[PDB]
Amino acid sequence: EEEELVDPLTTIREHCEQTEKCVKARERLELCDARVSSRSHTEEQCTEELFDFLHARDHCVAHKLFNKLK
Amino acid sequence: GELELHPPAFPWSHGGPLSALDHSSVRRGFQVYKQVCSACHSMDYVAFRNLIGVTHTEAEAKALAEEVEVQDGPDENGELFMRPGKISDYFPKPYPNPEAARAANNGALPPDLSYIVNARHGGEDYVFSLLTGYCDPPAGVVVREGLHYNPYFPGQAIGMAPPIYNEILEYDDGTPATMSQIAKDVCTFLRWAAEPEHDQRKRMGLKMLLISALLTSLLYYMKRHKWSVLKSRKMAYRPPK
Amino acid sequence: NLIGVTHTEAEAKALAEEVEVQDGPDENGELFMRPGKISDYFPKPYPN
Amino acid sequence: MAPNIRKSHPLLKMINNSLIDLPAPSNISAWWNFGSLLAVCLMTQILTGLLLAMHYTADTSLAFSSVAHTCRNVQYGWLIRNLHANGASFFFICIFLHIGRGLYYGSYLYKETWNTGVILLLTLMATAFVGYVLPWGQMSFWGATVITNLFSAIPYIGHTLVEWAWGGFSVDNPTLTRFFALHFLLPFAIAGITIIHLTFLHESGSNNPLGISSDSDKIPFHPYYSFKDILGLTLMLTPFLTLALFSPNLLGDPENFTPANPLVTPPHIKPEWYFLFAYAILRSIPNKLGGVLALAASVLILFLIPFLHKSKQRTMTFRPLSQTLFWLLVANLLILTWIGSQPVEHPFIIIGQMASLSYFTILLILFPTIGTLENKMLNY
Amino acid sequence: ALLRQAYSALFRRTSTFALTVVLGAVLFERAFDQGADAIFEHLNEGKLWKHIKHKYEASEE
Amino acid sequence: IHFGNLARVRHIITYSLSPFEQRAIPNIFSDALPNVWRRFSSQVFKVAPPFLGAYLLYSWGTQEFERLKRKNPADYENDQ
Amino acid sequence: AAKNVVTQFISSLSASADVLALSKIEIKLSDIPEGKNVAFKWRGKPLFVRHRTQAEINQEAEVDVSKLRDPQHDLDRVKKPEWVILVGVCTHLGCVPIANSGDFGGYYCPCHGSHYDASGRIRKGPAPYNLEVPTYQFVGDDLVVVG
Amino acid sequence: AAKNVVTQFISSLSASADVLALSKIEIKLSDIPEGKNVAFKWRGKPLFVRHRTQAEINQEAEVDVSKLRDPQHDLDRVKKPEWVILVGVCTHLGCVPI
Ligand code: HEC
Ligand code: HEM
Ligand code: HEM
Ligand SMILES: CCCCCCCCO[C@@H]1O[C@H](CO)[C@@H](O)[C@H](O)[C@H]1O
Ligand code: FES
Ligand code: FES
């Protein structure tokens, strides 16, 4: 249990990741990661996808995060 | 150009043109800075007296400054020496010179935080994002020895190791020191350090509008009132035709 | 300042090398000594 | 000597013949309010300026913090600093409308009033340019280094002229000081020249929107325009204050909150907004020398306007063709401004050159040409 | 009728017009300030030092 | 001396009333607004166009810039 | 509006925050040993706060000096007993007196002689007036706030 | 008279004595051994004077002049094979190299 310390951040981050555009982006990222990790001579990187994701997730967080902070 | 991720817009309690700073959050922030950042970050333009009537009492302030030793002098013999701080002193620098600073942080130079929220696009929204936002590099990206990955920092390789973590300190006001709470309060404090006039400036803006709207209307009527003579004026052409 | 007035560029370069001045900081932020250049001003006898 | 003192007195007589009994057309519009604002604008800069100068220190080692210490410790220092800084933009905003108005209503036909006008603009530019270096911030320093070095492209006497200006080998303390000197000086020259401007102006009297002789209907400046201008003063002053007070740094580069540092070039060194339009035309011409001239011409072109008037009419009130051409040109300047703010890469680089080309084409060829065509369509 | 009265006692004589503008100002200041300050504070309940001061103003150590 | 040597005028009568016998802002709906609209109409198609035509160019140039920053998968399709 | 903007600009010329911050210094009376004189920095100039023992309000308060050069009556502009607070500056050529020596056991200005007694009064010397006595207050005995 | 007073005043704006004094610097090569790079302060910015060995001067000849962003061979730079003098400032954005 009835008393432990949790950062509302990680909580609202989980909740947002199960949102349509986050999922869609999170998905494209996993694929990228997967095919970039599976190769040994590619110039490619997964920044772009990581961003599209973080951008979508974080935009979501902002809308709610401060509601739970003092 | 090049890729970069832009921070989001958090609804700060002081974002409203008519909304002031939450001095409680600022007071916490000062602690965060004092107990964490001040370890590597200088805040040259703020002095202990500045806190008085803003976040602390003249007494608390006098105390907070005595917790530090400063370098005064010279004395009768021309030597330098130490003494307990006064409210007239400015927040202590962590390093003698930048060279020494870089030396203790892997050649990196922690910038003075006096105007940081105005020195970076995004201010708090950016500083806040940066702090909480550390994470592992995506595929294909390698961060060189000594730097840490942060997608929010340009280049994504930042010399600052995540500075705050849950319960890294205890707000003596009884506030759950979750990492985000910290970043939030400290960012709020940084806003204030960057521009103490914040509240007064906004309170003035209010007055300015009210008077402005009143004065404008009045002068519009006056302008119209005088001009009426012309606006309605009528003429005619009467030759002896 | 002496050059072309009381001494030759050479004598002057010498007269200044006879003194050690305080420059810095270095790579580590420390101060240090070095032999004077003609660009230096006559040494102060006391710190303050 | 004479009945009322307002006319006899060697001084009131002056104040009277230019602010009270002065013949003004009855139909001038809001676009004529900019003269007075520019004037007020000026008196205001000088006032806030002096106030800031009484706390400033011109030395690389103290400039940045002198300004900071002012906003931080001087009663209302922060307010004065803001008012002065934002005041500079309000200044240019106004001057750009003032000019515009002139162009669209063929005011330039008053050659001498107009030519002194161009001189006021040039002077104001130098003034605002040197002013910006005073706080010695990253952008202050770097902009100063890039902009002043431009002259180095001038043949033979290039480098010499620059190192002279700098007082050394690079923008350093000897520059900061002479700039502070210049910045304090120029404003006063502006004031002086404004007197000449209005002096030539008064020879002919104001022009008016319909562009036809307004002698058949003139009115005393006071109260008509004294009142009208005081109204236009508050109408603009509101947005100025609203900005200056609610969104203080809405227009300033955050890079200038970082003390100048010669060992860190900022990513994008660009001048203040009111200069971009020309900075843009500068980069349009790849060739350090040609680009400079193009810059110079971008403003010096104003001196030719009077000789490129072909219309049988003065204003554009009754010239619809010229009107779109006029608004095109405005829009064109907007784009140029925009281009100046972006990096030097595709698709900007090309848009840049295009806008720069359309700029000179419109003023040098289209305008006078469409002007002539318009005369034929009227059977002239 | 105030307009009529106002005109007579206050606006007719230039000397009294001036007196009205001054005393009028003195009272307008006093009231405009108090009012605006009031509005600003309500709009910011519990954020100003004025509000949280009590916690450390003779209630600690 | 500019009032008296301005123009040779003959036969024009004008009539006007003291500012106190008339309204400051009169006929706002019957005359004022209808004209505001009138004036607004006569110009839109002269001004608006090039300003709109500016916006577009801005939008295109902006969006295209961002596009060229994005990666084209057709560079890594055969990087086994 | 005008009143405010003028007031604001006008006051932009009076002492700034950093200056008012050094305006006054607060000295703790209850930490000063008897007889021994202590000096603190106040407004860039030495401030003398001496604790009178037992032979000060006596040996240098009963002195019979008929005609004085400065109308010095301890009840005119002074106050507390065992406490003497002076501006460590000589009224001759702005030099700072000393606490150790003193022909009159008081202070001695090494610039031209000027001897001051235990209460800070010119005795033997060229300095006209007596060491200046600055404004102060006692709203808390164990604490004095000069300035 | 005029020419003089103007000349005098005009030149009162060009570099002062103290500045010309830092105009140029003379470095003693004897202080710099081969295989070790040394940096001096010139015009507020680092000045690199390295003693290149007959070895690195060779690695220098195997440099493909057409495969560089700024096409220049050791020919178009140094005056003495064993000596390389550069301005310690990165061409990108004002940083000092290692
Ligand atoms: C161990 C020292 C250290 C601590 C403690 C630390 N920082 Fe830093 N910080 C640095 C370093 C190193 C840099 C420079 C990173 C670089 O420029 O590569 C830095 C940079 C920063 C920057 C951003 C620099 C930029 O260019 O955007 C900010 C903002 C910042 N720190 C905030 C904080 C705050 C707030 C705290 C306290 C919560 C904090 N730091 C604590 C060392 C520290
Ligand atoms: C320090 C800046 C300047 C000041 C304070 C100033 C002031 C004035 C004033 C008071 C007027 C009379 C009222 C009006 O019509 O607005 C005026 C008119 C005029 N100004 Fe300026 N001016 C300035 C800059 C310029 C510039 C840059 C030009 C153009 C290159 C210019 C061109 C003119 C012209 C042509 C008139 C005639 C207006 C008409 O058509 O009747 N002025 N100016
Ligand atoms: C012609 C009107 C003026 C213009 C257009 C102008 C413009 C500027 C500009 C753009 C700056 C930089 C502001 C910033 O971002 O920090 C500035 C700063 C400054 N100006 Fe002016 N200025 C003018 C007149 C004056 C005058 C007459 C003085 C006083 C004699 C003055 C004194 C200063 C000082 C001291 C600063 C430095 C402090 C600061 O940066 O805020 N200015 N000015
Ligand atoms: C258009 C004219 C606008 C002028 C508006 C005057 C408002 C400035 O008023 C200011 O308000 C502050 C907030 O309480 C006070 O602390 C200042 O002392 C006061 O001068
Ligand atoms: S200054 Fe003290 S004796 Fe002269
Ligand atoms: S790599 Fe960017 S400044 Fe050197």
PDB file of N, CA and C in Angstrom, chain D residues 193-233:
ATOM      1  N   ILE D 193      19.033  65.291 -39.010  1.00  0.00           N
ATOM      2  CA  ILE D 193      18.540  65.057 -40.346  1.00  0.00           C
ATOM      3  C   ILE D 193      17.011  65.022 -40.425  1.00  0.00           C
ATOM      4  N   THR D 194      16.338  64.532 -39.389  1.00  0.00           N
ATOM      5  CA  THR D 194      14.889  64.548 -39.438  1.00  0.00           C
ATOM      6  C   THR D 194      14.406  65.983 -39.625  1.00  0.00           C
ATOM      7  N   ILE D 195      15.074  66.946 -38.990  1.00  0.00           N
ATOM      8  CA  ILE D 195      14.679  68.344 -39.141  1.00  0.00           C
ATOM      9  C   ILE D 195      14.781  68.735 -40.613  1.00  0.00           C
ATOM     10  N   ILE D 196      15.877  68.357 -41.270  1.00  0.00           N
ATOM     11  CA  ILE D 196      16.032  68.662 -42.704  1.00  0.00           C
ATOM     12  C   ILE D 196      14.877  68.008 -43.503  1.00  0.00           C
ATOM     13  N   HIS D 197      14.615  66.725 -43.224  1.00  0.00           N
ATOM     14  CA  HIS D 197      13.550  65.961 -43.869  1.00  0.00           C
ATOM     15  C   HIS D 197      12.273  66.791 -43.810  1.00  0.00           C
ATOM     16  N   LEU D 198      11.817  67.118 -42.606  1.00  0.00           N
ATOM     17  CA  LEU D 198      10.602  67.920 -42.473  1.00  0.00           C
ATOM     18  C   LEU D 198      10.741  69.318 -43.091  1.00  0.00           C
ATOM     19  N   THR D 199      11.959  69.837 -43.156  1.00  0.00           N
ATOM     20  CA  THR D 199      12.140  71.153 -43.741  1.00  0.00           C
ATOM     21  C   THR D 199      11.854  71.144 -45.223  1.00  0.00           C
ATOM     22  N   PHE D 200      12.350  70.135 -45.925  1.00  0.00           N
ATOM     23  CA  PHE D 200      12.095  70.019 -47.355  1.00  0.00           C
ATOM     24  C   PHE D 200      10.620  69.702 -47.491  1.00  0.00           C
ATOM     25  N   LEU D 201      10.148  68.799 -46.638  1.00  0.00           N
ATOM     26  CA  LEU D 201       8.762  68.408 -46.721  1.00  0.00           C
ATOM     27  C   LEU D 201       7.880  69.619 -46.740  1.00  0.00           C
ATOM     28  N   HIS D 202       8.070  70.519 -45.783  1.00  0.00           N
ATOM     29  CA  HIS D 202       7.218  71.695 -45.695  1.00  0.00           C
ATOM     30  C   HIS D 202       7.192  72.641 -46.878  1.00  0.00           C
ATOM     31  N   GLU D 203       8.187  72.558 -47.750  1.00  0.00           N
ATOM     32  CA  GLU D 203       8.216  73.411 -48.925  1.00  0.00           C
ATOM     33  C   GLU D 203       6.970  73.184 -49.769  1.00  0.00           C
ATOM     34  N   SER D 204       6.631  71.909 -49.954  1.00  0.00           N
ATOM     35  CA  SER D 204       5.493  71.454 -50.766  1.00  0.00           C
ATOM     36  C   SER D 204       4.232  71.115 -49.980  1.00  0.00           C
ATOM     37  N   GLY D 205       4.415  70.642 -48.755  1.00  0.00           N
ATOM     38  CA  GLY D 205       3.276  70.262 -47.952  1.00  0.00           C
ATOM     39  C   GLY D 205       3.080  68.791 -48.214  1.00  0.00           C
ATOM     40  N   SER D 206       2.227  68.138 -47.430  1.00  0.00           N
ATOM     41  CA  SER D 206       1.986  66.712 -47.612  1.00  0.00           C
ATOM     42  C   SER D 206       1.325  66.365 -48.932  1.00  0.00           C
ATOM     43  N   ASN D 207       1.458  65.109 -49.314  1.00  0.00           N
ATOM     44  CA  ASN D 207       0.842  64.579 -50.523  1.00  0.00           C
ATOM     45  C   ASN D 207      -0.481  63.962 -49.996  1.00  0.00           C
ATOM     46  N   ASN D 208      -1.289  63.333 -50.836  1.00  0.00           N
ATOM     47  CA  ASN D 208      -2.500  62.735 -50.305  1.00  0.00           C
ATOM     48  C   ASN D 208      -2.920  61.543 -51.159  1.00  0.00           C
ATOM     49  N   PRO D 209      -3.641  60.584 -50.569  1.00  0.00           N
ATOM     50  CA  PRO D 209      -4.078  59.398 -51.306  1.00  0.00           C
ATOM     51  C   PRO D 209      -4.583  59.539 -52.735  1.00  0.00           C
ATOM     52  N   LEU D 210      -5.403  60.533 -53.052  1.00  0.00           N
ATOM     53  CA  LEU D 210      -5.869  60.666 -54.435  1.00  0.00           C
ATOM     54  C   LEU D 210      -4.801  61.224 -55.364  1.00  0.00           C
ATOM     55  N   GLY D 211      -3.679  61.665 -54.826  1.00  0.00           N
ATOM     56  CA  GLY D 211      -2.631  62.207 -55.679  1.00  0.00           C
ATOM     57  C   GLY D 211      -2.899  63.470 -56.516  1.00  0.00           C
ATOM     58  N   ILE D 212      -3.939  64.220 -56.172  1.00  0.00           N
ATOM     59  CA  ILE D 212      -4.278  65.443 -56.902  1.00  0.00           C
ATOM     60  C   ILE D 212      -4.207  66.642 -55.955  1.00  0.00           C
ATOM     61  N   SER D 213      -3.920  67.812 -56.493  1.00  0.00           N
ATOM     62  CA  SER D 213      -3.785  69.002 -55.660  1.00  0.00           C
ATOM     63  C   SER D 213      -4.840  69.179 -54.577  1.00  0.00           C
ATOM     64  N   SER D 214      -4.402  69.217 -53.321  1.00  0.00           N
ATOM     65  CA  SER D 214      -5.318  69.377 -52.187  1.00  0.00           C
ATOM     66  C   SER D 214      -5.421  70.804 -51.629  1.00  0.00           C
ATOM     67  N   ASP D 215      -5.045  71.803 -52.433  1.00  0.00           N
ATOM     68  CA  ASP D 215      -5.082  73.210 -52.016  1.00  0.00           C
ATOM     69  C   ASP D 215      -6.519  73.671 -51.842  1.00  0.00           C
ATOM     70  N   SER D 216      -7.420  73.046 -52.589  1.00  0.00           N
ATOM     71  CA  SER D 216      -8.823  73.426 -52.515  1.00  0.00           C
ATOM     72  C   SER D 216      -9.474  72.946 -51.250  1.00  0.00           C
ATOM     73  N   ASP D 217      -8.718  72.240 -50.413  1.00  0.00           N
ATOM     74  CA  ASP D 217      -9.283  71.697 -49.185  1.00  0.00           C
ATOM     75  C   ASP D 217      -8.244  71.336 -48.153  1.00  0.00           C
ATOM     76  N   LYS D 218      -7.575  72.329 -47.575  1.00  0.00           N
ATOM     77  CA  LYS D 218      -6.585  72.032 -46.549  1.00  0.00           C
ATOM     78  C   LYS D 218      -7.132  72.320 -45.166  1.00  0.00           C
ATOM     79  N   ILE D 219      -6.567  71.692 -44.138  1.00  0.00           N
ATOM     80  CA  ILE D 219      -7.045  71.910 -42.766  1.00  0.00           C
ATOM     81  C   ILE D 219      -5.879  72.130 -41.812  1.00  0.00           C
ATOM     82  N   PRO D 220      -6.107  72.867 -40.714  1.00  0.00           N
ATOM     83  CA  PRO D 220      -5.009  73.098 -39.783  1.00  0.00           C
ATOM     84  C   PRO D 220      -4.583  71.784 -39.156  1.00  0.00           C
ATOM     85  N   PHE D 221      -3.280  71.560 -39.086  1.00  0.00           N
ATOM     86  CA  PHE D 221      -2.743  70.346 -38.507  1.00  0.00           C
ATOM     87  C   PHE D 221      -3.452  70.084 -37.196  1.00  0.00           C
ATOM     88  N   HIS D 222      -3.454  71.090 -36.325  1.00  0.00           N
ATOM     89  CA  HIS D 222      -4.125  70.984 -35.025  1.00  0.00           C
ATOM     90  C   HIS D 222      -5.564  71.503 -35.143  1.00  0.00           C
ATOM     91  N   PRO D 223      -6.542  70.760 -34.587  1.00  0.00           N
ATOM     92  CA  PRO D 223      -6.481  69.500 -33.849  1.00  0.00           C
ATOM     93  C   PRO D 223      -6.550  68.256 -34.700  1.00  0.00           C
ATOM     94  N   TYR D 224      -6.985  68.419 -35.942  1.00  0.00           N
ATOM     95  CA  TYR D 224      -7.151  67.296 -36.838  1.00  0.00           C
ATOM     96  C   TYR D 224      -6.056  66.254 -36.800  1.00  0.00           C
ATOM     97  N   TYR D 225      -4.836  66.618 -37.159  1.00  0.00           N
ATOM     98  CA  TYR D 225      -3.775  65.620 -37.129  1.00  0.00           C
ATOM     99  C   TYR D 225      -3.044  65.441 -35.793  1.00  0.00           C
ATOM    100  N   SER D 226      -3.009  66.482 -34.971  1.00  0.00           N
ATOM    101  CA  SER D 226      -2.373  66.319 -33.682  1.00  0.00           C
ATOM    102  C   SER D 226      -3.183  65.191 -33.022  1.00  0.00           C
ATOM    103  N   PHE D 227      -4.506  65.294 -33.098  1.00  0.00           N
ATOM    104  CA  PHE D 227      -5.356  64.275 -32.521  1.00  0.00           C
ATOM    105  C   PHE D 227      -5.221  62.945 -33.219  1.00  0.00           C
ATOM    106  N   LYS D 228      -5.271  62.968 -34.551  1.00  0.00           N
ATOM    107  CA  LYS D 228      -5.165  61.741 -35.334  1.00  0.00           C
ATOM    108  C   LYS D 228      -3.855  61.026 -35.029  1.00  0.00           C
ATOM    109  N   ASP D 229      -2.754  61.754 -34.944  1.00  0.00           N
ATOM    110  CA  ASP D 229      -1.489  61.107 -34.641  1.00  0.00           C
ATOM    111  C   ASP D 229      -1.437  60.546 -33.215  1.00  0.00           C
ATOM    112  N   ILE D 230      -1.991  61.266 -32.243  1.00  0.00           N
ATOM    113  CA  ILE D 230      -1.981  60.791 -30.864  1.00  0.00           C
ATOM    114  C   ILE D 230      -2.786  59.511 -30.778  1.00  0.00           C
ATOM    115  N   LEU D 231      -3.746  59.357 -31.678  1.00  0.00           N
ATOM    116  CA  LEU D 231      -4.557  58.149 -31.693  1.00  0.00           C
ATOM    117  C   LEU D 231      -3.736  57.013 -32.287  1.00  0.00           C
ATOM    118  N   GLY D 232      -3.089  57.312 -33.406  1.00  0.00           N
ATOM    119  CA  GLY D 232      -2.271  56.324 -34.067  1.00  0.00           C
ATOM    120  C   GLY D 232      -1.105  55.940 -33.187  1.00  0.00           C
ATOM    121  N   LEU D 233      -0.749  56.806 -32.244  1.00  0.00           N
ATOM    122  CA  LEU D 233       0.357  56.499 -31.349  1.00  0.00           C
ATOM    123  C   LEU D 233      -0.069  55.391 -30.401  1.00  0.00           C
TER     124      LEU D 233
END
